[PDB]
From a paper:
Here, we report that [name], a guanine nucleotide exchange factor (GEF) for Rho family GTPase, is a novel interaction partner of [name]. Through its [name] domain, [name] can bind to the tyrosine-phosphorylated cytoplasmic domains of several membrane receptors and then mediate different extracellular signals to intracellular responses. Increasing evidence has shown that the tyrosine phosphorylation site Y682 in the intracellular tail of [name] is crucial for [name] function. Our research demonstrated that [name] can interact with [name] through its [name] domain which binds directly to the Y682-phosphorylated [name] intracellular tail.
A crystal structure of [name]-[name] domain in complex with the [name]-derived phosphopeptide [name]-pY682 (QNG-pY-ENPT, residues 679–686 of APP695) was determined at 2.45 Å resolution, which revealed a conserved recognition mechanism. ITC reported a binding Kd of 0.86 μM for [name]-[name] in complex with [name]-pY682 peptide and no binding of [name]-[name] and [name]-Y682. The peptide lies in an extended backbone conformation roughly perpendicular to the central β-strands of the [name] domain. Phosphotyrosine pY682′ inserts into the canonical pY-binding pocket formed by R680, R698, R700, H719 and K721. The phosphate moiety of pY682′ forms a hydrogen bond network with the side chains of R680, R698 and R700. Residue E683′ (pY + 1) makes hydrophobic interactions with the side chains of residues K718, I720, F756 and L759. Residue P685′ (pY + 3) patches on the surface of the pY + 3 pocket formed by EF and BG loops and makes contacts with T732, S755 and F756. Residue N684′ (pY + 2) does not interact with [name] domain. However, when bound to Grb2-[name] domain the peptide adopts a U-shape conformation. This is due to the presence of a bulky Tryptophan residue (W121) in the EF loop of Grb2-[name], which is a Threonine residue (T732) at the corresponding position of [name]-[name]. ITC experiments showed that mutation of R680 to Ala in [name]-[name] domain nearly abolished its binding with [name]-pY682.
Author numbering:
A (entry chain C): 665 to 769
B (entry chain A): -1 to 5
The structure:
Amino acid sequence: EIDYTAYPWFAGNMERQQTDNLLKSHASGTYLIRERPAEAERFAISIKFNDEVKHIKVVEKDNWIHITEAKKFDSLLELVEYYQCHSLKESFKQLDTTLKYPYKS
Amino acid sequence: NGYENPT
């Protein structure tokens, strides 16, 4: 098990509204991984873009971690690490940006 | 739904 408390992009268990209050004041590409208060042990990537905070479910299925079925990872850390370098465009044309800046910057 | 949808 990986301890995600280490990373400056992990916000723990935090509500959707609190996330839009926290991220609205930052540049596009600022992101955080949070745990969804309504689904225990399920996570979300929240990322500011176009002056609005977008939210993406992290699905866990058949031991894969993924935000699109077309690209899968062994772990949440590897997911985040891939999308820090490769734009979300390849599966979210609504959202052309990498995970550039963790919110604790 | 509620979140963002892929593709």
